[PDB]
Design a protein around this motif. Structure first.
Motif, PDB file in Angstrom:
ATOM      1  N   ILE A   1       2.815-112.833 -78.669  1.00  0.00           N
ATOM      2  CA  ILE A   1       3.873-113.356 -78.065  1.00  0.00           C
ATOM      3  C   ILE A   1       4.115-112.190 -76.866  1.00  0.00           C
ATOM      4  O   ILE A   1       4.565-111.166 -77.612  1.00  0.00           O
ATOM      5  N   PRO A   2       4.349-112.466 -75.513  1.00  0.00           N
ATOM      6  CA  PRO A   2       4.634-111.527 -74.716  1.00  0.00           C
ATOM      7  C   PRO A   2       6.080-111.637 -74.506  1.00  0.00           C
ATOM      8  O   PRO A   2       6.677-112.285 -73.757  1.00  0.00           O
ATOM      9  N   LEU A   3       7.080-110.770 -75.278  1.00  0.00           N
ATOM     10  CA  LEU A   3       8.304-110.651 -75.314  1.00  0.00           C
ATOM     11  C   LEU A   3       8.539-109.832 -74.053  1.00  0.00           C
ATOM     12  O   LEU A   3       7.845-108.664 -73.624  1.00  0.00           O
ATOM     13  N   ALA A   4       9.822-110.140 -73.283  1.00  0.00           N
ATOM     14  CA  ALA A   4      10.388-109.630 -72.397  1.00  0.00           C
ATOM     15  C   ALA A   4      11.811-109.539 -72.478  1.00  0.00           C
ATOM     16  O   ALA A   4      12.563-110.530 -72.817  1.00  0.00           O
ATOM     17  N   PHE A   5      12.321-108.000 -72.408  1.00  0.00           N
ATOM     18  CA  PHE A   5      13.910-107.982 -72.740  1.00  0.00           C
ATOM     19  C   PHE A   5      14.272-107.598 -71.428  1.00  0.00           C
ATOM     20  O   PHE A   5      13.995-106.468 -70.980  1.00  0.00           O
ATOM     21  N   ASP A   6      15.364-107.919 -71.111  1.00  0.00           N
ATOM     22  CA  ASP A   6      16.341-107.683 -69.848  1.00  0.00           C
ATOM     23  C   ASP A   6      17.401-106.759 -70.720  1.00  0.00           C
ATOM     24  O   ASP A   6      18.649-107.492 -70.858  1.00  0.00           O
ATOM     25  N   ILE A   7      17.589-105.441 -70.871  1.00  0.00           N
ATOM     26  CA  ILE A   7      18.399-104.762 -71.444  1.00  0.00           C
ATOM     27  C   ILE A   7      19.671-104.610 -70.209  1.00  0.00           C
ATOM     28  O   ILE A   7      19.222-103.862 -69.238  1.00  0.00           O
ATOM     29  N   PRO A   8      20.984-104.722 -70.762  1.00  0.00           N
ATOM     30  CA  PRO A   8      21.939-104.184 -69.652  1.00  0.00           C
ATOM     31  C   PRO A   8      21.947-102.779 -69.352  1.00  0.00           C
ATOM     32  O   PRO A   8      21.669-102.095 -70.315  1.00  0.00           O
TER      33      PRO A   8
ATOM     34  N   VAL B   1       9.547-120.482 -77.500  1.00  0.00           N
ATOM     35  CA  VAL B   1       8.583-119.660 -76.862  1.00  0.00           C
ATOM     36  C   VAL B   1       7.710-120.481 -75.761  1.00  0.00           C
ATOM     37  O   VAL B   1       6.858-120.844 -76.212  1.00  0.00           O
TER      38      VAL B   1
ATOM     39  N   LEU C   1      24.246-100.939 -71.703  1.00  0.00           N
ATOM     40  CA  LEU C   1      24.029-100.769 -73.358  1.00  0.00           C
ATOM     41  C   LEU C   1      23.390 -99.438 -73.356  1.00  0.00           C
ATOM     42  O   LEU C   1      23.163 -98.658 -74.582  1.00  0.00           O
TER      43      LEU C   1
ATOM     44  N   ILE D   1      16.337-110.083 -84.058  1.00  0.00           N
ATOM     45  CA  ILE D   1      16.160-109.224 -82.894  1.00  0.00           C
ATOM     46  C   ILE D   1      17.302-108.235 -82.837  1.00  0.00           C
ATOM     47  O   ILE D   1      18.707-108.570 -83.017  1.00  0.00           O
TER      48      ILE D   1
ATOM     49  N   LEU E   1      13.570-115.714 -85.297  1.00  0.00           N
ATOM     50  CA  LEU E   1      13.473-114.297 -84.983  1.00  0.00           C
ATOM     51  C   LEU E   1      14.705-113.572 -85.014  1.00  0.00           C
ATOM     52  O   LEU E   1      15.826-113.992 -84.928  1.00  0.00           O
TER      53      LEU E   1
ATOM     54  N   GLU F   1      21.511-101.414 -82.769  1.00  0.00           N
ATOM     55  CA  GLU F   1      22.464-101.873 -83.972  1.00  0.00           C
ATOM     56  C   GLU F   1      23.248-102.998 -83.467  1.00  0.00           C
ATOM     57  O   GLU F   1      24.174-103.702 -84.128  1.00  0.00           O
ATOM     58  N   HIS F   2      23.100-103.654 -82.390  1.00  0.00           N
ATOM     59  CA  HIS F   2      23.442-105.122 -81.815  1.00  0.00           C
ATOM     60  C   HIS F   2      22.261-105.889 -82.507  1.00  0.00           C
ATOM     61  O   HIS F   2      21.201-106.042 -81.784  1.00  0.00           O
TER      62      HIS F   2
ATOM     63  N   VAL G   1      18.892-104.627 -81.195  1.00  0.00           N
ATOM     64  CA  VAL G   1      18.776-103.568 -80.140  1.00  0.00           C
ATOM     65  C   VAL G   1      20.028-102.707 -80.313  1.00  0.00           C
ATOM     66  O   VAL G   1      21.271-103.007 -79.937  1.00  0.00           O
TER      67      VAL G   1
ATOM     68  N   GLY H   1      24.458-109.862 -74.214  1.00  0.00           N
ATOM     69  CA  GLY H   1      24.353-109.250 -72.842  1.00  0.00           C
ATOM     70  C   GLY H   1      22.732-108.998 -72.621  1.00  0.00           C
ATOM     71  O   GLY H   1      22.515-108.892 -71.498  1.00  0.00           O
ATOM     72  N   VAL H   2      21.871-108.691 -73.482  1.00  0.00           N
ATOM     73  CA  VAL H   2      20.471-108.423 -73.485  1.00  0.00           C
ATOM     74  C   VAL H   2      19.681-109.783 -73.435  1.00  0.00           C
ATOM     75  O   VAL H   2      20.022-110.600 -74.276  1.00  0.00           O
ATOM     76  N   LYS H   3      18.800-110.288 -72.455  1.00  0.00           N
ATOM     77  CA  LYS H   3      18.095-111.564 -72.417  1.00  0.00           C
ATOM     78  C   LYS H   3      16.861-111.181 -72.849  1.00  0.00           C
ATOM     79  O   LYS H   3      15.896-110.656 -72.212  1.00  0.00           O
ATOM     80  N   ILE H   4      16.722-112.004 -73.974  1.00  0.00           N
ATOM     81  CA  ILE H   4      15.105-112.209 -74.357  1.00  0.00           C
ATOM     82  C   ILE H   4      14.439-113.467 -74.010  1.00  0.00           C
ATOM     83  O   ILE H   4      15.279-114.416 -74.046  1.00  0.00           O
ATOM     84  N   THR H   5      13.339-113.222 -73.522  1.00  0.00           N
ATOM     85  CA  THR H   5      12.352-114.341 -73.107  1.00  0.00           C
ATOM     86  C   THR H   5      11.038-114.071 -73.760  1.00  0.00           C
ATOM     87  O   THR H   5      10.310-113.157 -73.621  1.00  0.00           O
ATOM     88  N   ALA H   6      10.579-115.008 -74.617  1.00  0.00           N
ATOM     89  CA  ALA H   6       9.473-114.973 -75.423  1.00  0.00           C
ATOM     90  C   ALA H   6       8.527-115.647 -74.514  1.00  0.00           C
ATOM     91  O   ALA H   6       8.379-116.913 -74.303  1.00  0.00           O
ATOM     92  N   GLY H   7       7.561-115.036 -73.927  1.00  0.00           N
ATOM     93  CA  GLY H   7       6.479-115.635 -73.139  1.00  0.00           C
ATOM     94  C   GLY H   7       5.772-116.662 -73.686  1.00  0.00           C
ATOM     95  O   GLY H   7       5.662-116.908 -74.936  1.00  0.00           O
ATOM     96  N   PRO H   8       4.854-117.472 -72.927  1.00  0.00           N
ATOM     97  CA  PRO H   8       3.876-118.418 -73.660  1.00  0.00           C
ATOM     98  C   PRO H   8       2.887-117.739 -74.567  1.00  0.00           C
ATOM     99  O   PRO H   8       2.450-116.625 -74.344  1.00  0.00           O
TER     100      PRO H   8
END
Ligand SMILES: *[C@@H]1O[C@H](CO)[C@@H](O[C@@H]2O[C@H](CO)[C@@H](O)[C@H](O)[C@H]2NC(C)=O)[C@H](O)[C@H]1NC(C)=O
Ligand SMILES: *[C@@H]1O[C@H](CO)[C@@H](O)[C@H](O)[C@H]1NC(C)=O
Lengths: 98, 247, 122, 150, 100, 105, 50, 51, 148
Positions: free
Chosen positions: D24-31, E47, D34, E34, E32, E38-39, E36, E57-64
């Motif tokens: 799974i290619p996860l991508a995380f946009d971390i503020p 997916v 934080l 997740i 899942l 301790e959040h 980050v 506030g952290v945006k998670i995107t599980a690619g194809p």
């Protein structure tokens, strides 16, 4: 002439339910280098269904009715068997060459 | 003559026990087939049954009869009313104690039934009955003629040969016929000449008492809320897995 | 709930009589039953009891070995066979029902019958 | 009982689960808010590492002690920037100068890896021994690698 | 004597039947856990590379899923809680003595 | 072996509290029941245990016991109390036994 | 022959697997039973039976 | 599977792979799954005797 | 034949009503035996239908006795035992694991399955006609007409 006079329901239709099914005696497993040998003593004819967890399942299903010994290769990437009504059992190999 | 072979069994009683296939569904039958031994030749089998043979309801020698437990009462029936079949009707050779020597053909299950009044009590178990032919010619039915050859058969013999099974003090059998409603309260009425152990969960305070006379529990309102155990243990019983264990 | 008696009256010394007691309003098959007599001017005197199955019966010393008790549960009736009369048995006889709510084993009596006169004289 | 990749099959909805297939290619946009400065968090100085035990096995058969001399006690993360070793634990607690324990599973027979810990990293190295049982009842935890040499 | 016969569904068909389906494309969704810094969150992420899960506030995107693959062929059957790969006849081509 | 003894007659004033005693060997352990009985009418039990009344009977009655003596206490003596009373005890020896009737007047 | 001691139901409470030394014995303490005899349910506590 | 030094011996070694299962809900019994008797199985597959 | 209702059309627990030459006679259900390879056990009956517990076989027979004359009917329909699960057995186990199976429920409620009831066809009865004096007399039963 016209003869149809009514409809009458049919009882005793099939319904789902929980249903007692035997469990065959626990298979005797012996381990070896990328190998698993099952010693099986079924009380009634049991379906041994085995497969591999790689890209090629290489599944086999056999109706064992007499005692048997079945040796299967367990690759580094998994193997499993369901014998009779027991839950599926997983097995994974490791590097243990002499 | 034979009375000396029953002196141990005279101290026992028949019992009800679970059977997977009664006349309708799984039930608590008076004839529960605990074991089906068919390791001999010529199709002879030795069944072990919750009911007893060879002695009447009062413990006396009465030959070809069965005594069986019907909801606490030892009832009696001639052995010729009894029938049993595995894949085709069997024949009752003799019965003694808990055990029954019969002649049966091969089958994947064995069923034993008898009719009393208008109720047909049956019990069928999946224990395989084997027909082992003696010798090198596999007959499904013994021949009319031939040669005599060595064989092992379940003998029509009730004498003591050194093999024993165990007697055990019976567990207390629960009975809901003992408990009823009266005065808008739970009333428990033990059978006369016996005793009952009554355990009720009422008023947030468990009450456990032993009684031989009618008792009315003012703190209990629903008869489901209390249990009555038929505390009778004068006669012993085989330690079948179908019965509770005594303390 | 009712107990109704019958069968007494007047009889001869050394003879035989019967007292019967019929019950209604409860399941008669479960409860012990009692007979208790009372002479004119004197207090109650226990006659006998039966134990709701016929298995056990008890009688008093002053009436020991003479009289008989039985009960037919299906027909719902209690019989006191009043045999071998004596002169001083003259008294009222009450059919009574053993009471629940007993706590320790005590044999309380809940409901009493009306009472039947029994006279023994020439 | 025949699906590839060991998939379990269920019928409401029609579906397959737990297919050990691909990645799974996860991508995380971390503020930006934080993140925390290096100065605030516990800073590690003069660390040493030693594999007090190693069992080359599917599970975390490898144990390593890190002797640390921290600037201030607290908690902070631990990792291995390589596929050689996979750690059981994410973070460890530190008390001035002392020792801490890291569990891991490994592929290399002659392991060597950079254990990154608390704004530093220590070069853990050692020799490792084979496992006990031929067959185990759980899947691999450590990333396989070509090198298993003398 | 004029006689006529016909076929009709079994009385038990309302509860004892097999469903012949066609399966077209895959959708991968994973439960899942997740964390980050301790959040921590426990979610169900679709997916596909599009649907985000945006807690804290952290945006998670599980690619194809990198190797698109399914164990179901284009044309499947359900019966008694079991899924079979079977090339059942198209609606209107069912032949006698066989499925359909 | 056990005899229950009560006073043969009792004199009481209406509106006050009165007591009728009953004694006997081993009476303390054994239950002491109490029955109200008008001479011609059927007996009706007033106290079924050492302590408790059956349902429906007036609350002014209460038994008691101490050591090897027992009592029936009547609060607010009424004309309805104007009747004979009996103390009963059961034992495995002789089964049921009643005492001498206490004639209230 | 597989000898079997009677299942020693202790209801609305726990038990222990008190051992002995019979040949190849197995003892196990099942929780959450609710037995039915010919006369009704053996006990009342729907859980915590043993 | 079961073996004793003598037919009358008081000590016997047993290895039958006996394992217990839960009783059926509402039922009262001690279920088990066990290997079928090795003696019966041998009798089924015994090669013909030395005679 | 029919089950669950008596000769007059009222409800009755376990009885079979069957036509005997135009008269609806009745018999208790426990007198009606049936067997496929071994004897079966009638779980229940309702209307035209009978829920029974049978073993496998190549033909099924239902029979009873009345007025000392045996009545029987054996038909070649195959009856088959279908074990649930992956262990094959001929008789259900005394114990085991619980698994899903579809069984003919002992349930008479109105589910979504119907059969049809039509106007009966006229039934010939030669007992109604008798010879008397070189001419043919025909006598319908009382209350029901006849077409001659
Ligand atoms: C029923 O059981 C009770 C005890 O639970 C018996 O009552 C006791 O009996 C013994 C021996 O007769 C006496 O010594 C005790 O004093 C009795 N109990 C009390 C508290 O008084 C009773 O006798 C039994 N009845 C039957 C029918 O046998
Ligand atoms: C993920 O979170 C769930 C929360 O219910 C928890 O049950 C599960 O064990 C967690 N898995 C792990 C090991 O992270």
């Amino acid at each position: 002439g016209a003869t149809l006079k009514g409809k009458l329901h049919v009882p005793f239709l099939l319904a789902d339910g929980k249903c007692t099914v035997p469990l065959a005696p626990e298979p005797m497993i012996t381990f070896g280098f990328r190998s698993v040998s099952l010693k099986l003593h079924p009380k009634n004819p049991t379906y041994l269904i085995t497969r591999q967890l790689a890209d090629e399942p290489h599944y086999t299903h056999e109706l064992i009715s007499e005692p048997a010994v079945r040796n299967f290769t367990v690759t580094e990437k998994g193997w499993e068997f369901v014998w009779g009504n027991h839950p599926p059992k997983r097995f994974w190999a490791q590097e243990t060459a002499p | 003559s034979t009375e000396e072979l029953f002196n141990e069994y005279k101290l026992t009683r028949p019992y009800m026990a679970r059977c997977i296939r009664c006349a309708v569904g799984s039930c608590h039958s008076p004839i529960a087939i605990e074991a089906v031994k068919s390791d001999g030749h010529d199709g002879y089998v030795r069944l072990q049954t919750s009911s007893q043979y060879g002695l009447d309801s009062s413990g006396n020698l009465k030959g070809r009869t069965m005594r069986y437990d019907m909801h606490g009462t030892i009832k009696e029936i001639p052995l010729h009313q009894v029938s049993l079949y595995t894949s085709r009707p069997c024949h009752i050779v003799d019965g003694h104690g808990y055990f029954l020597l019969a002649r049966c053909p091969a089958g994947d299950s064995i069923t034993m039934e008898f009719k009393k009044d208008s109720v047909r009590h049956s019990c069928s178990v999946p224990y395989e009955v084997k027909f082992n032919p003696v010798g090198r010619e596999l007959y499904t039915h013994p021949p009319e003629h031939g040669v005599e050859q060595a064989c092992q058969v379940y003998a029509h013999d009730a004498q003591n040969r050194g093999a024993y099974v165990e007697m055990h003090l019976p567990g207390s059998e629960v009975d809901s016929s003992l408990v009823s409603l009266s005065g808008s309260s739970v009333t428990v009425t033990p059978p006369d000449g016996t005793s009952a152990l009554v355990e009720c969960e009422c008023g947030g305070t468990k009450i456990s008492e032993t009684i031989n006379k009618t008792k009315q529990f003012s703190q209990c309102t629903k008869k489901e809320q209390c249990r009555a155990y038929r505390l009778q243990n004068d006669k012993w019983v085989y330690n079948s897995d179908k019965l509770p264990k005594a303390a | 709930v009712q107990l109704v008696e019958s069968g007494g009256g007047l009889a001869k010394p050394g003879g035989s009589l019967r007292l019967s007691c019929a019950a209604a309003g409860f399941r008669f098959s479960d409860f012990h039953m009692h007979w208790v007599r009372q002479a004119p001017g004197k207090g109650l005197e226990w006659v006998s009891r039966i134990s709701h199955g016929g298995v056990t019966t008890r009688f008093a010393d002053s009436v020991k070995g003479r009289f008989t008790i039985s009960r037919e549960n299906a027909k719902n009736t209690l019989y006191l066979q009043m045999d071998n009369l004596r002169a001083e048995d003259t008294a009222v006889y009450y059919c009574a029902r053993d009471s629940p709510y007993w706590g320790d084993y005590s044999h309380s009596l809940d409901v009493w019958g009306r009472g039947v006169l029994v006279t023994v004289s020439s | 009982f025949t699906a590839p990749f060991g998939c379990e099959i269920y019928t409401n909805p029609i579906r397959a689960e737990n297919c050990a297939v691909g990645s799974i290619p996860l991508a995380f946009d971390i503020p930006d808010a934080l993140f925390t400065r290096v100065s605030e968090t516990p800073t590690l100085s003069a660390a040493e590492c030693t594999l007090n035990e190693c069992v080359y096995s599917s599970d975390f058969g490898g144990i390593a002690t890190v002797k640390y001399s921290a600037s201030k006690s607290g908690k902070c993360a631990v990792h291995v920037p390589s596929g050689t070793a996979t750690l059981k634990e994410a973070a460890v607690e530190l008390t001035e100068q002392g020792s801490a324990t890291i569990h891991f599973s490994t592929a290399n027979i002659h392991p060597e890896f950079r254990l990154q810990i608390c704004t530093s990293y220590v070069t853990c190295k050692g020799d490792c021994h084979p496992p006990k049982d031929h067959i185990v009842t759980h899947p691999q935890y450590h990333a396989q690698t070509f090198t298993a040499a003398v | 004597q004029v006689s006529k016969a016909y076929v009709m569904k079994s009385d038990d068909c309302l509860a004892d039947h097999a469903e012949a389906y066609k399966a077209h494309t895959a959708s991968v969704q994973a439960f899942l856990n997740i964390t980050v810094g301790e959040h921590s969150i426990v979610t169900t992420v679709y997916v596909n590379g599009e649907t985000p899960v945006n807690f804290n506030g952290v945006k998670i995107t599980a690619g194809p899923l990198s190797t698109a693959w399914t164990p179901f062929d284009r044309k499947i059957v359900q019966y008694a809680g079991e899924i079979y790969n079977y090339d059942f006849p198209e609606y209107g081509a069912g032949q006698p003595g066989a499925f359909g | 072996p056990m005899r229950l003894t009560q006073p043969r007659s009792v004199s009481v004033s209406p509106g006050q509290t009165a007591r009728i005693t009953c004694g006997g060997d081993n009476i303390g352990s054994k239950s002491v029941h109490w029955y109200q009985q008008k001479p011609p009418q059927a007996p009706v039990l007033v106290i079924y245990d050492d302590r408790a009344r059956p349902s429906g009977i007036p609350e002014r009655f209460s038994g008691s016991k101490s050591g090897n003596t027992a009592t029936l206490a009547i609060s607010g003596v009424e004309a309805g109390d104007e009747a004979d009373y009996y103390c009963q005890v059961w034992d495995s020896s002789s089964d049921v036994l009643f005492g001498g009737g206490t004639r209230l007047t | 022959k597989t000898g079997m001691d009677s299942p020693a139901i202790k209801c609305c409470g726990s038990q222990e697997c008190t051992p002995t030394y019979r040949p190849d014995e197995q003892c196990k303490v099942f929780t959450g039973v609710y037995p039915f005899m010919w006369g009704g349910a053996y006990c009342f506590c729907d859980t915590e039976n043993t | 599977d079961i073996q004793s030094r003598t037919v009358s011996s008081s000590d016997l070694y047993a290895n039958t792979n006996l394992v217990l299962q839960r009783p059926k809900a509402g039922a009262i019994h001690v279920p088990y799954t066990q290997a079928p008797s090795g003696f019966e199985q041998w009798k089924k597959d015994k090669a013909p005797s030395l005679k």
